[PDB]
C-alpha cells in the first residue's frame, strides 16, 4: 500500500493514542528505519499488515476493531489531505456515490501510479437499500468497509446499518454487505 495510507494510520494512532504509543508500535512492528512514510511512494503490505499486528498488541484492540476505526478516518483524511474535490465530485448522496468508487479509484490511479484498487459493484434493492460487492486483491480487509460506510453516513448525513451478508473466508466470491440508510425519517418519526 502507499505510503498515503500508512500516514494515516500514523496519524490516526497518534491522534488517538499520543506520539510515543505511535512509536512504541512502530518499534514493535519492525519498522524504525523508516524515519517516516512517503505519500506517493509504494510499499509493501507487509508494513500495513505489520503496523496493526503491532498496535493491536499495544492498544489491546483486535484487528478487525482498528481497521473499522480507520475506515471511518480514511473519510475524512482523504478530504482533508486534498483529494477532497475527487470526493466531492463522485455523488451527491450515498447511493450516487457507491456507483462512482471504481471510477473514483481510477481518477486517483493518476497520481498513484502502481494502485490496486479495490472493486465494488452497487446493486439497489430500493430507496432505502441495497447491496454492495467488495472484491478485492487483499485478505481481510472486508472490516474496512465497515468502518467506510460509516464514514459515509456522517459524510451524507445518512444513517447506515450494514451487515454482512456474505465473507469470502467462507467460500464466497465476495464479500457483500447490506446496507439500510435512512435520512430524517429516522428522527421525527
Ligand atoms: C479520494 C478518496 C480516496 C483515495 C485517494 C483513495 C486511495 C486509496 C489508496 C491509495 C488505497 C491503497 C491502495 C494501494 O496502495 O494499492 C486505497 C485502498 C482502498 N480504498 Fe480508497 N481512496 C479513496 C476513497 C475511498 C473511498 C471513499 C472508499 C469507500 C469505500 C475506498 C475504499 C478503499 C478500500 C476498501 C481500499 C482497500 C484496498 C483493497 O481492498 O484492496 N476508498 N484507496
Known sequence: MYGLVNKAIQDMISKHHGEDTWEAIKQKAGLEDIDFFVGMEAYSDDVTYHLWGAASEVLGKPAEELWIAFGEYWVTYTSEEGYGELLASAGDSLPEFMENLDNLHA???????????????????????????????????????????????????????????????????????????????????
Open 107 to 189: 481518477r486517483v490511479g493518476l497520481s498513484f501510479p502502481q494502485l490496486r484498487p479495490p472493486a465494488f459493484e452497487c446493486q439497489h434493492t430500493s430507496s432505502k437499500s441495497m447491496e454492495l460487492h467488495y472484491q478485492s486483491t487483499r485478505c481481510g480487509l472486508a472490516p474496512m468497509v465497515l468502518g467506510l460506510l460509516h464514514g459515509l453516513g456522517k459524510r451524507f448525513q445518512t444513517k447506515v446499518e450494514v451487515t454482512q451478508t456474505a465473507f469470502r473466508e467462507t467460500g464466497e466470491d465476495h464479500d457483500i454487505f447490506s446496507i439500510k440508510y435512512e435520512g430524517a425519517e429516522n428522527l421525527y418519526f
